[PDB]
Design a protein around this ligand. Structure first.
Ligand SMILES: *[C@@H]1O[C@H](CO)[C@@H](O)[C@H](O)[C@H]1NC(C)=O
Ligand SMILES: *[C@@H]1O[C@H](CO)[C@@H](O)[C@H](O)[C@H]1NC(C)=O
Ligand SMILES: *[C@@H]1O[C@H](CO)[C@@H](O)[C@H](O)[C@H]1NC(C)=O
Lengths: 89, 50
């Protein structure tokens, strides 16, 4: 189901991946970098399981980020937001 | 260029295609057809003294 939109219009190419970018208390770490240079909209990502901490802050470590997708789309991208999904019980 | 192409054991990342050196000289290259990592090394050369 989709709730963030109701309609669309004419736009550019769409890319699609078959997998996903996704006791049980062991937290994870999903780092992302959205850089827009020379027209190409580059995106980096790297996942690593981290130990659950008390303050739930950034772990004291080092992990390189690897590219996973490149899109030659974008004209003026000086704004962005985020989207979450709540579990309706 | 020119050089012997052998099967190298360089653990190339998926998004990586080429491999350079200190002098920006290509040492390894990924085969476009098959997923294989070769290496570019000249065969033999040296000075000649008489
Ligand atoms: C549709 O194409 C026009 C072409 O002029 C473009 O200006 C517009 O941004 C595109 N997307 C829309 C209308 O959502
Ligand atoms: C992008 O938007 C900002 C503010 O809305 C504006 O100052 C700037 O000129 C815009 N750039 C382009 C290329 O449209
Ligand atoms: C290359 O293309 C030919 C064309 O028929 C095909 O038979 C072959 O399996 C392809 N090889 C690879 C590695 O894609």
């Amino acid at each position: 189901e989709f709730r963030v939109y109701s309609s669309a219009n004419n736009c550019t190419f769409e890319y699609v991946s078959q997998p996903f970018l996704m006791q049980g208390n062991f937290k994870n770490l999903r780092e992302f970098v959205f850089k827009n240079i020379d027209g190409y909209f580059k995106i980096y990502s790297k996942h690593t399981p981290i130990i659950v901490r008390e303050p739930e802050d950034l772990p004291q470590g080092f992990s390189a980020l690897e590219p996973l997708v490149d899109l030659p789309i974008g004209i003026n991208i000086t704004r962005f937001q985020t989207l979450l999904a709540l579990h309706r019980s | 260029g020119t050089g012997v192409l052998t099967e190298s054991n360089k653990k190339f990342l998926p998004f990586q295609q080429f491999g350079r050196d200190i002098a920006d000289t290509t040492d390894a290259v990924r085969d476009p057809q098959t997923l294989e990592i070769l290496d570019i090394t000249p065969c033999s050369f040296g000075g000649v003294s008489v």
